[PDB]
Amino acid sequence: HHWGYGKHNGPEHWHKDFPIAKGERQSPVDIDTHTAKYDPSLKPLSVSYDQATSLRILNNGHAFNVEFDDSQDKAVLKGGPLDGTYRLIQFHFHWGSLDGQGSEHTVDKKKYAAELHLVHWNTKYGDFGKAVQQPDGLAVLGIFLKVGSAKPGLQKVVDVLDSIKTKGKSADFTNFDPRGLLPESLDYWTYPGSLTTPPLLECVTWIVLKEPISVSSEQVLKFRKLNFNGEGEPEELMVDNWRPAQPLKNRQIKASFK
Template sequence: MTGQHCWGYGDEDGPSEWHRYYPIAYGNRQSPIDIISSQAVYNASLNPLVVSYDHCTSINLSNNGHSVMVEFDDNDDKTVISGGPLDGSYRLKQFHFHWGTQQNSGSEHTVDGKSFPCELHLVHWNAKAYSSFGEAASASDGLVVIGVFLETGGNHPGLNRLTDALYMVKFKGTRAQFDNFNPKCLLPSNLEYWTYPGSLTTPPLNESVTWIVLKEPIKVSDKQMGKFRNTLLFSGEEEDQRVHMVNNFRPPQPLNGRTVQASFKC
């Protein structure tokens, strides 16, 4: 078992076993973390986060066996974020989700020990400093991920097009065209955030991510969350055993002396 094929979210290949193939799992800036709001340091010099997704080009929707993902054309600077804790702009590469089986578990980051049913990750890379996403993913300042919590409430109109399309990528390894989707509709109106230096939350667990975790969740319906839990499978179409894609999250990791900064006063 090598590379990307040796990990998952089961008892034998889940997060507690990842260190066997990825020793950096015990590194000093691993993600996710539990954000203790009272210990976050307000930094008045942090700028507002600027999201410029208006000209983004979504390409496809896919099931990679670990999550459902929407990929974007990242060949130019039309789709970028800037401001916040960032020195420059970072291009959007993809977004994906992590979720659980019930309302009180599923997010990767937690806040004061509280978990949310789901967490959205919008993954960006430093195209000014690096020539490819792969190169950026192994550099300490290569990636920026915006984390958005999903909590159950009313129906989220912006999410409907995605949840209605999940049946097309039910099985691991499937992909479907998914164009003209602007992920700005998945952001809350309030972009106040916590930020800290961290890592990818899936193997290879590179410590290359500046995390921007938004304080305000978006509200989605039980029906919408149900489509994630009941439609998608960890298994491929050719496999006899059909395993629902749930609990695809890594638990919080030690902070190891890192400072979590806040763009807002508690």
């Protein structure tokens, strides 16, 4: 009876195995755009992905992760609210069963069709495993997806999904360039929070871009053909793999922009 997103194991149940689910800096959260204060000391975000090396795409039973070689300083996030340099380890998405839901963060209670998470770890902790044990161990860049025009840079991801339909399947996935997933603007909101899946560790500086990217209905439809189950098990479509907004608890959300 492992955690997931169903009626009997979904986000409302997580606190039983992961008591930090009711902690002081849980994610995601609703971004109240009227109370997020502009902070002119926040720096431009620096996203250096030109040397990114993707290796593999994996269905882990909760999402698909596109994984990167993080054994050298190749694809780093820095600047913004961060001190130091954070190395990209993987990205993944959360999405809905319908276009009207799917994002984890919300913006004045608005839910987007999906949300992309580019996960980075603080190089001063040596690796991802040690970083998640630190309050500033991770920097996660969150990007909202709305349904409209296709995102051409997403199409190589969408097209390999039939090869990792079920939990546990992986596929070679080299030379994918994540710069094809970024909006024009790097204006962002930022706040201290957590992983949004178990173990829900409170190790993340969240950086959520104000500008969503557009993906086509056909692109998000193919996300929804994935499976939570493993091969040869009853088919359960991987949809609504999103945790809802959690209490802000007096944390302040800061805006990079006026």
